[PDB]
Amino acid sequence: LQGAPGAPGSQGAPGLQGAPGAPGSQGAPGLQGAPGAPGSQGAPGLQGAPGAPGSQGAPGLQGAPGAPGS
Amino acid sequence: LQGAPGAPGSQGAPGLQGAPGAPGSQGAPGLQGAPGAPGSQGAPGLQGAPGAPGSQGAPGLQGAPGAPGS
Amino acid sequence: QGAPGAPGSQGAPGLQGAPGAPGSQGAPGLQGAPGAPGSQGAPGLQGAPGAPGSQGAPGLQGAPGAPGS
Amino acid sequence: QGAPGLQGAPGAPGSQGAPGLQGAPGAPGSQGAPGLQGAPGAPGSQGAPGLQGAPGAPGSQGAPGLQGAP
Amino acid sequence: SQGAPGLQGAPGAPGSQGAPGLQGAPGAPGSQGAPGLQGAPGAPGSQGAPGLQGAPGAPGSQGAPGLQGA
Amino acid sequence: GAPGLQGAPGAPGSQGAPGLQGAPGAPGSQGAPGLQGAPGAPGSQGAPGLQGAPGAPGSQGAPGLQGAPG
Amino acid sequence: GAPGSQGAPGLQGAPGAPGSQGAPGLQGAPGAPGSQGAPGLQGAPGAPGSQGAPGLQGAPGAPGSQGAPGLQG
Amino acid sequence: PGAPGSQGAPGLQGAPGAPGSQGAPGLQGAPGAPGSQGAPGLQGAPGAPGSQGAPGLQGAPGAPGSQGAPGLQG
Amino acid sequence: GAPGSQGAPGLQGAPGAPGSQGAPGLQGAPGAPGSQGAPGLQGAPGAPGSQGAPGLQGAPGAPGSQGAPGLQG
Amino acid sequence: QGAPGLQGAPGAPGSQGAPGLQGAPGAPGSQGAPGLQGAPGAPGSQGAPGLQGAPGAPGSQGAPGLQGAPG
Amino acid sequence: GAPGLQGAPGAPGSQGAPGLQGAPGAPGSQGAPGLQGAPGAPGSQGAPGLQGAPGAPGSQGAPGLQGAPGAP
Amino acid sequence: GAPGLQGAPGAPGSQGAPGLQGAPGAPGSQGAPGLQGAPGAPGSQGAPGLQGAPGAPGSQGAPGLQGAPG
Amino acid sequence: APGLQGAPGAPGSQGAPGLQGAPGAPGSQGAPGLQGAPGAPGSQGAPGLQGAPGAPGSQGAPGLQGAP
Amino acid sequence: PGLQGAPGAPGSQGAPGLQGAPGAPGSQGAPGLQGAPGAPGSQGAPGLQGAPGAPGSQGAPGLQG
Amino acid sequence: GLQGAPGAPGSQGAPGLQGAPGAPGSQGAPGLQGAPGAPGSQGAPGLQGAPGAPGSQGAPGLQGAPG
């Protein structure tokens, strides 16, 4: 008999994986930001009182001047 | 009679390289994960008396005693 | 009788099918640094200099000249 | 009478599996919508400086007269 | 007449054997979030009041306008 | 001598065997927030402070009358 | 006689049909929608009222209002 | 002569029933995703404009010079 | 005896039929950047200016007052 | 007769596989939000009362003690 | 007669891969930062203090015009 | 002399359109785009903290004289 | 009588090669340094002394008589 | 009788005959590197009052006359 | 027992693809947007307020009261 005919063998589909790997996305929530951190200002911050004067009870006052007359 | 009585049979084919792609990865990404906030607003309040209430020295008076005569 | 050889692609043609897991890329990580102004306030002008002055100074005109005899 | 050992056909050295995708899942942060600053504060218009009359020195300035001769 | 066959090749499996590979599906598309945002008032400390002269007056208390008596 | 070649049980096989499907899908998220937070109450109003009224006390001694020794 | 009868058939195989519908993805980037608003430029009227100097000046009330200036006698 | 036993009746030969769609027939649904827009910043200015004028004109400054009112002069 | 029996013209390939070849999964359509909108009302839009501008530190010439009522003669 | 005929009806096609794959459109540039506003300050000339021009009585020159010409 | 038979011949060529439309390689986007806005100088507006706060009155408090009898 | 033509046409592995045919050509730009519009922050200008010049004549002369220079 | 048939392995099947597989494909660039846009917004260089706030003068004797 | 048709062994002529280049960007990264802007030369206000002293009239009246 | 072998290609791997044709693709950088040379502002001094004159005011000279 002629047993030569054997046809293709158990061909290899599952053999070998092309190139595995997750997609490229990995990261972290960014990096250095900038100043912030709200706070306060301090309300009354304009000219205070240029020489805020004081109690002026009486100016130059001629107190009962004496007039020598004997 | 005869002519191919051998047995070349079936030869198991090799496995094709799978689909190749660029490996990657994923995580907890983003941006501004370090919001610095050195602004830290703390501006001071007033830097002096409220209105700098004057009328303070109060040196007012006639002057020397009022000693008249004649 | 007859000469039938091993027919078909017997000799392990091979690499017919790709059993892979192709990736796309590696890792486009964090992107943006910025995102905060910085507005630390400043101490405004002095509240007020409390009570400078006091012009109350009298003239001291306390009966100049000897009082009349 | 025996002779023709009809060559068995190698089908495939594969396996009856299903697409196995979840190779190593789990690299999340569930996004970041709470982005480290949310902290709504609703601040504004603190204590009003109801600055008012600072009484310096009320007065009348009584009237000197000439009709006190005894 | 009749013989005996055999010589069956690799019958690995008529399947699709799927083995997961590496890092994939967790809970990425979750959106999430709570501190959405804030912002609007920024109201400076309530406008308290401008000041006023609390108790003005008229100084004096000497008089004696050309007085020769009392 | 050599009978009809009986038959080859087709070795059950179809290959495939994905084997590795790394990075199944959406492998983790992070960073999808809103605006901001942590606002502070702006400093109080900058209105004029208590105006210390004039240091003009009640003048009462000014009335001296007098006028003549008798 | 006759050439015997049928020797060896085949039946390919039962239709797998559209290959097993694989694993779809999830929302592409299902981020929290809507432009996140920020504080208004000048939201709260902390002090948009009188922003000048609507005051007065000291002519009246305590003006040059002395008593008797004096004269002969 | 008889019947040695032939080979016929080929039920199926190369018309593959099993292959239905192959090539990953249909990519399973791609869920449309939402997302925020260009999140607005400063919008809304019903506040102090930023023009605090000045200390309202001092109502009671400027002692108006008086007539003196010294007194009689004999 | 044994009339010539065909041993091949009958069949032409017997089985075959790959099967079901897993369909793929479309990944969700992307979204958009950020969290929700709503500019909000609890920030710090810093109203500058103040009602210290009103001022109005009195009205009359309060400083002077004077009025010491001398005589004239 | 040594052998009969045969007919090898063509066999080869019908195996539409798949070489490497596209991956489809990854994602578009996600414009964020702009940084944040610049430094602080109440826009304007932060003026402040300098000082008086009227030392006490402005230009009154009262001459306290001015002669009343009491002839 | 004489024998004879053949196998493998007859194949029409396996259906080749049409491939993929366009180019593969799913790209990946990223998050744009933003611009820090125009700045400002901490301070305020104002000024009017020209007569900020009166000082000592010239050479005397206020109009005196006092005199006293000195002539006949 | 009757031969038998080919009976087992050698079938190699066919190929086809790989899976997702969509050329990625990813949406938009595939990156962190340009920074958004810098929000112009306000800010004060030069603080005129010194007016001190009202044209006021604040001044006096000198005690005139004893009176009626004779 | 019959001989045999043509058995050309794959005349014309191939011979044309396929473009080089897997080029690292050089010649790229991105995120060129930082795009900081350095320009000092307002002449970063410290400015000079701002307009000097002139102090008031000072004057001695306008005239003294004392003893004539 | 007697022939082999056209037997010369199975010449494949090869196989990978269309294209192999996936392509790639190359040497990522460009110079750029500006450094971010500066700021406005912050005029630190003027000074003030170099010598206000006593603008007036120190007549210094004499005596005994 | 005759045989005539007209012939056939025999065996080949001619195409064999190749490796790395050379930049069949490229990444153009976003360039250097802005203007390099990172500056930073600085504070100006203040002109010493124009000195009017150090203390010279006083009491104008009138007389010395010979009496």
Short mmCIF file of N, CA, C and O in Angstrom, two decimals, chain G residues 5-71:
data_model
loop_
_atom_site.label_atom_id
_atom_site.label_comp_id
_atom_site.label_asym_id
_atom_site.label_seq_id
_atom_site.Cartn_x
_atom_site.Cartn_y
_atom_site.Cartn_z
N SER G 5 -18.57 0.58 -1.41
CA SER G 5 -19.37 1.77 -1.15
C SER G 5 -18.51 2.79 -0.41
O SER G 5 -17.28 2.67 -0.35
N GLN G 6 -19.18 3.77 0.19
CA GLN G 6 -18.52 4.95 0.74
C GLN G 6 -17.41 4.57 1.73
O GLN G 6 -17.57 3.66 2.54
N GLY G 7 -16.28 5.28 1.64
CA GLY G 7 -15.14 5.02 2.50
C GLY G 7 -14.89 5.97 3.66
O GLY G 7 -14.71 5.52 4.79
N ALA G 8 -14.86 7.28 3.40
CA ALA G 8 -14.48 8.25 4.43
C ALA G 8 -15.03 9.65 4.18
O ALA G 8 -14.53 10.36 3.30
N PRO G 9 -16.06 10.08 4.92
CA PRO G 9 -16.58 11.44 4.75
C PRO G 9 -15.99 12.43 5.75
O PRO G 9 -15.15 12.07 6.58
N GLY G 10 -16.43 13.69 5.66
CA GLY G 10 -16.16 14.66 6.70
C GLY G 10 -17.30 15.66 6.79
O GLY G 10 -18.15 15.72 5.91
N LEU G 11 -17.31 16.42 7.88
CA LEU G 11 -18.38 17.39 8.11
C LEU G 11 -17.82 18.71 8.64
O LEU G 11 -18.40 19.33 9.53
N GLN G 12 -16.71 19.17 8.06
CA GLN G 12 -16.00 20.34 8.56
C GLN G 12 -16.11 20.50 10.06
O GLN G 12 -15.17 20.20 10.81
N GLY G 13 -17.26 20.99 10.52
CA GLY G 13 -17.45 21.33 11.91
C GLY G 13 -18.58 22.31 12.12
O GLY G 13 -18.87 23.13 11.25
N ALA G 14 -19.20 22.25 13.29
CA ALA G 14 -20.40 23.04 13.55
C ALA G 14 -20.05 24.53 13.59
O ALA G 14 -19.10 24.91 14.28
N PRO G 15 -20.80 25.38 12.89
CA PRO G 15 -20.49 26.82 12.89
C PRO G 15 -20.34 27.42 14.27
O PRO G 15 -21.30 27.49 15.05
N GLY G 16 -19.12 27.87 14.59
CA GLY G 16 -18.94 28.74 15.74
C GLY G 16 -19.65 30.07 15.59
O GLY G 16 -19.83 30.78 16.59
N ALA G 17 -20.06 30.42 14.37
CA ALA G 17 -20.83 31.64 14.15
C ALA G 17 -19.92 32.84 14.37
O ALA G 17 -18.70 32.67 14.50
N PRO G 18 -20.47 34.06 14.39
CA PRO G 18 -19.64 35.21 14.79
C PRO G 18 -18.84 34.89 16.03
O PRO G 18 -19.42 34.63 17.09
N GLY G 19 -17.52 34.90 15.90
CA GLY G 19 -16.66 34.56 17.01
C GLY G 19 -17.10 35.20 18.31
O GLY G 19 -17.71 36.27 18.30
N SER G 20 -16.82 34.54 19.43
CA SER G 20 -17.33 34.97 20.72
C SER G 20 -17.12 36.47 20.89
O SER G 20 -15.98 36.94 20.93
N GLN G 21 -18.22 37.22 20.96
CA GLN G 21 -18.12 38.66 21.12
C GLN G 21 -17.28 38.98 22.35
O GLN G 21 -17.67 38.68 23.48
N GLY G 22 -16.13 39.60 22.11
CA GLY G 22 -15.13 39.75 23.15
C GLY G 22 -15.52 40.72 24.24
O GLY G 22 -16.71 40.93 24.50
N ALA G 23 -14.53 41.31 24.89
CA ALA G 23 -14.79 42.24 25.97
C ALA G 23 -14.75 43.66 25.42
O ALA G 23 -13.69 44.11 24.97
N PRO G 24 -15.87 44.38 25.42
CA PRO G 24 -15.83 45.78 25.01
C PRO G 24 -15.14 46.64 26.06
O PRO G 24 -14.85 46.16 27.16
N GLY G 25 -14.87 47.89 25.72
CA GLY G 25 -14.33 48.84 26.67
C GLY G 25 -15.42 49.50 27.48
O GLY G 25 -16.60 49.16 27.39
N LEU G 26 -15.01 50.46 28.29
CA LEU G 26 -15.92 51.27 29.07
C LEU G 26 -15.88 52.69 28.53
O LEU G 26 -15.10 53.01 27.63
N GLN G 27 -16.73 53.55 29.09
CA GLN G 27 -16.79 54.94 28.66
C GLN G 27 -15.38 55.47 28.42
O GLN G 27 -14.51 55.36 29.28
N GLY G 28 -15.16 56.00 27.22
CA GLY G 28 -13.83 56.40 26.82
C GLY G 28 -13.10 57.17 27.90
O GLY G 28 -12.11 56.69 28.46
N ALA G 29 -13.60 58.37 28.21
CA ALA G 29 -13.10 59.16 29.33
C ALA G 29 -14.28 59.76 30.07
O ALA G 29 -14.51 60.98 30.04
N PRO G 30 -15.07 58.93 30.76
CA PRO G 30 -16.30 59.43 31.39
C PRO G 30 -16.01 60.33 32.58
O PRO G 30 -16.46 60.04 33.70
N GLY G 31 -15.28 61.41 32.36
CA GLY G 31 -15.00 62.34 33.43
C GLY G 31 -16.25 63.09 33.87
O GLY G 31 -17.23 63.21 33.14
N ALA G 32 -16.20 63.59 35.10
CA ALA G 32 -17.32 64.34 35.64
C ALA G 32 -17.62 65.52 34.72
O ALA G 32 -16.85 66.48 34.65
N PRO G 33 -18.73 65.47 33.99
CA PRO G 33 -18.97 66.45 32.92
C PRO G 33 -19.24 67.84 33.47
O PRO G 33 -19.45 68.05 34.66
N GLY G 34 -19.23 68.80 32.55
CA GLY G 34 -19.53 70.18 32.89
C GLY G 34 -18.31 71.00 33.24
O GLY G 34 -17.52 70.60 34.11
N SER G 35 -18.12 72.13 32.57
CA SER G 35 -17.02 73.02 32.93
C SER G 35 -17.16 73.40 34.40
O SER G 35 -18.04 74.18 34.76
N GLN G 36 -16.27 72.88 35.24
CA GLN G 36 -16.31 73.22 36.65
C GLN G 36 -16.15 74.73 36.79
O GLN G 36 -15.12 75.29 36.44
N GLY G 37 -17.19 75.40 37.26
CA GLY G 37 -17.09 76.83 37.46
C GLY G 37 -16.15 77.18 38.60
O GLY G 37 -15.88 76.38 39.49
N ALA G 38 -15.66 78.40 38.57
CA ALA G 38 -14.80 78.89 39.64
C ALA G 38 -15.44 80.12 40.26
O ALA G 38 -16.52 80.54 39.81
N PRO G 39 -14.83 80.72 41.28
CA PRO G 39 -15.43 81.91 41.87
C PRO G 39 -15.62 82.99 40.83
O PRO G 39 -14.81 83.16 39.92
N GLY G 40 -16.72 83.73 40.97
CA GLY G 40 -16.90 84.91 40.15
C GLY G 40 -15.76 85.88 40.33
O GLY G 40 -15.02 85.85 41.31
N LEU G 41 -15.58 86.76 39.34
CA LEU G 41 -14.54 87.76 39.47
C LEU G 41 -14.78 88.64 40.69
O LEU G 41 -13.85 88.95 41.44
N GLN G 42 -16.03 89.05 40.90
CA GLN G 42 -16.36 89.95 42.00
C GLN G 42 -17.70 89.58 42.63
O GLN G 42 -18.55 90.43 42.87
N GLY G 43 -17.88 88.29 42.93
CA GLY G 43 -19.16 87.81 43.41
C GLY G 43 -19.81 88.59 44.54
O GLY G 43 -20.79 89.30 44.31
N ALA G 44 -19.27 88.49 45.75
CA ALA G 44 -19.97 89.11 46.88
C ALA G 44 -19.67 90.60 46.94
O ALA G 44 -18.50 91.00 46.90
N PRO G 45 -20.69 91.44 47.03
CA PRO G 45 -20.45 92.87 47.22
C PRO G 45 -19.94 93.18 48.62
O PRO G 45 -20.65 93.79 49.42
N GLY G 46 -18.71 92.75 48.92
CA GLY G 46 -18.16 93.02 50.23
C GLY G 46 -18.13 94.50 50.54
O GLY G 46 -18.38 94.91 51.68
N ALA G 47 -17.83 95.33 49.55
CA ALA G 47 -17.94 96.77 49.70
C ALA G 47 -17.96 97.47 48.35
O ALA G 47 -17.06 98.26 48.05
N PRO G 48 -18.96 97.21 47.50
CA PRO G 48 -19.11 97.98 46.26
C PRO G 48 -19.99 99.21 46.39
O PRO G 48 -20.33 99.81 45.36
N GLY G 49 -20.36 99.60 47.61
CA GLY G 49 -21.23 100.75 47.81
C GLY G 49 -20.47 102.05 47.65
O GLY G 49 -19.74 102.23 46.67
N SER G 50 -20.65 102.97 48.59
CA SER G 50 -19.93 104.24 48.52
C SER G 50 -18.43 103.98 48.47
O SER G 50 -17.83 103.53 49.45
N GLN G 51 -17.82 104.28 47.33
CA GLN G 51 -16.40 104.07 47.11
C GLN G 51 -15.71 105.37 46.71
O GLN G 51 -14.89 105.41 45.79
N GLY G 52 -16.06 106.45 47.39
CA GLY G 52 -15.38 107.72 47.21
C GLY G 52 -14.96 108.33 48.53
O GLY G 52 -14.24 107.70 49.31
N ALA G 53 -15.41 109.55 48.78
CA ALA G 53 -15.21 110.18 50.08
C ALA G 53 -16.43 111.05 50.39
O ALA G 53 -16.28 112.24 50.68
N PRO G 54 -17.64 110.49 50.36
CA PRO G 54 -18.83 111.33 50.54
C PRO G 54 -18.95 111.84 51.97
O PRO G 54 -19.80 111.39 52.74
N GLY G 55 -18.07 112.79 52.32
CA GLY G 55 -18.09 113.41 53.61
C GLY G 55 -18.45 114.88 53.54
O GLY G 55 -19.04 115.36 52.57
N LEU G 56 -18.09 115.61 54.60
CA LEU G 56 -18.37 117.03 54.69
C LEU G 56 -17.08 117.80 54.97
O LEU G 56 -15.99 117.26 54.78
N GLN G 57 -17.21 119.07 55.34
CA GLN G 57 -16.06 119.85 55.79
C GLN G 57 -16.53 120.84 56.84
O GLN G 57 -17.70 121.20 56.90
N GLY G 58 -15.59 121.27 57.68
CA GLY G 58 -15.94 122.00 58.88
C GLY G 58 -16.05 123.50 58.74
O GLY G 58 -15.27 124.24 59.35
N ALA G 59 -17.00 123.97 57.94
CA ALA G 59 -17.38 125.38 57.95
C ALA G 59 -18.38 125.67 59.07
O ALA G 59 -18.18 126.60 59.86
N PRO G 60 -19.48 124.90 59.17
CA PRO G 60 -20.58 125.28 60.06
C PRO G 60 -20.41 124.82 61.50
O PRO G 60 -19.34 124.34 61.89
N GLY G 61 -21.45 125.01 62.31
CA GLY G 61 -21.55 124.36 63.60
C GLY G 61 -20.60 124.91 64.65
O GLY G 61 -21.03 125.39 65.70
N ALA G 62 -19.31 124.84 64.36
CA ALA G 62 -18.31 125.44 65.23
C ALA G 62 -17.50 126.44 64.41
O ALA G 62 -16.26 126.39 64.41
N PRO G 63 -18.17 127.37 63.72
CA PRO G 63 -17.46 128.32 62.86
C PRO G 63 -16.89 129.48 63.64
O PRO G 63 -16.85 129.46 64.88
N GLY G 64 -16.44 130.51 62.93
CA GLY G 64 -15.89 131.68 63.59
C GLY G 64 -16.97 132.46 64.31
O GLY G 64 -17.33 133.57 63.90
N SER G 65 -17.47 131.88 65.39
CA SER G 65 -18.66 132.35 66.09
C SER G 65 -18.36 132.79 67.52
O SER G 65 -19.04 132.39 68.46
N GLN G 66 -17.32 133.60 67.69
CA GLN G 66 -16.97 134.11 69.01
C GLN G 66 -18.10 134.95 69.58
O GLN G 66 -19.10 135.21 68.90
N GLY G 67 -17.96 135.39 70.83
CA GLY G 67 -18.96 136.22 71.47
C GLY G 67 -18.77 137.69 71.15
O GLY G 67 -18.81 138.08 69.98
N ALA G 68 -18.56 138.51 72.18
CA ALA G 68 -18.41 139.94 71.97
C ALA G 68 -16.95 140.27 71.71
O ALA G 68 -16.12 140.14 72.63
N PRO G 69 -16.58 140.70 70.50
CA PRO G 69 -15.18 141.07 70.25
C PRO G 69 -14.68 142.20 71.13
O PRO G 69 -13.51 142.20 71.53
N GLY G 70 -15.53 143.16 71.45
CA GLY G 70 -15.14 144.27 72.29
C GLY G 70 -14.94 145.56 71.51
O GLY G 70 -14.76 145.57 70.29
N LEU G 71 -14.99 146.66 72.24
CA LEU G 71 -14.85 148.00 71.67
C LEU G 71 -14.62 148.97 72.83
O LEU G 71 -14.37 148.55 73.97
#
